[PDB]
Amino acid sequence: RRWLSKTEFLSRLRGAQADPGLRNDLAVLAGDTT
Amino acid sequence: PAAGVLDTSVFIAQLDEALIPDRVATTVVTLAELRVGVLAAATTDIRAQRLATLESVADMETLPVDDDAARMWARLRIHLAESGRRVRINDLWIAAVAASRALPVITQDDDFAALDGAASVEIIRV
Ligand code: NA
Ligand code: NA
Ligand code: NA
Ligand code: NA
Numbered sequence: 001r002r003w004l005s006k007t008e009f010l011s012r013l014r015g016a017q018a019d020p021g022l023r024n025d026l027a028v029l030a031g032d033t034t
Numbered sequence: 035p036a037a038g039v040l041d042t043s044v045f046i047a048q049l050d051e052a053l054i055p056d057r058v059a060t061t062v063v064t065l066a067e068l069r070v071g072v073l074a075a076a077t078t079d080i081r082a083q084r085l086a087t088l089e090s091v092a093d094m095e096t097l098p099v100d101d102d103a104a105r106m107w108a109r110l111r112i113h114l115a116e117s118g119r120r121v122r123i124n125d126l127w128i129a130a131v132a133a134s135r136a137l138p139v140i141t142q143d144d145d146f147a148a149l150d151g152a153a154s155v156e157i158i159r160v
Contacts, residue, residue: 003037003057003095010051012094017047018071018087023143025074026042026067033120034111 038158039097039132041125042067043143045087050160054140059095061131063124097131106134110152119148129155 004012038055042064068088075081099107107130114121121129125145132139138156139146146157 001095002093003059004093006051006054006056006058009040009058009094010054012090013045016083016086016090018045018068018084019080020047021080022046022071022084022087023043025071029070029074030067030122030124032123034114034123034126 035138035156035158038138038140039128039135040064041128041139041141041143041146043141043145044160045090046142049142053158053160055138055158058140059097059137060091061097061128062099063127063131065091065096067124097135099127099131100134102134103127103131106130106154110149110155113152114148117148121145121148 035055037057040058040060045064045068068091071084072081072088075084107126110126110130122145129139129146129149133154136154138158140158140160142160149155150157
C-alpha cells in the first residue's frame with residue numbers, strides 16, 4: 001500500500017471501473033445522509 | 035495539487051484526467067463500499083467487473099478514519115446542521131479524512147458540493 005502516481009492509478013483503473021449500477025446499489029446500502 | 039483523496043464515485047463508470055493530482059490515495063470508506071459492491075452483485079459478469087474495481091485499490095494507500103478525521107467529521111457535521119445542508123454520512127467520513135490531512139477530495143459525483151468553503155475542504159470534480 002502506497003501513494004499511486006496519476007499514471008499508475010489511471011493504469012490500474014482503466015478497464016476496471018465498476019458498472020454504473022453500483023451507484024444504485026450504494027444508494028440502497030450507504031445512501032443515508034446527515 | 036500534489037496529492038488527493040479519491041472517493042468511491044471515481045471508481046465507478048471518462049474522467050477529467052487533467053484535474054487528478056499527481057499522487058492519489060483513497061480511504062477505508064471506499065474500500066468498504068467497493069467490497070459491498072462485490073458482495074451485492076446480482077450476476078457473475080457484474081461481480082467480475084466489481085471484483086476488478088476492488089482489486090484496483092490493492093496497492094493504493096487506504097487512509098483510515100483516525101482521531102484527526104473523527105474531530106474533523108464533528109466540525110463538518112455541525113457546519114452542515116447549522117446551514118441545513120446535507121451530505122451522505124459515508125461521504126462526510128471521506129471528506130473528514132481528506133480535510134484532516136489537508137488534502138482535496140477527488141470526486142466524479144455531486145455530493146461534496148454542500149461543503150464548499152468549509153475550512154480544510156477542497157473538492158475537485160472530475
Ligand atoms: Na474514499
Ligand atoms: Na455478488
Ligand atoms: Na482490495
Ligand atoms: Na479537503
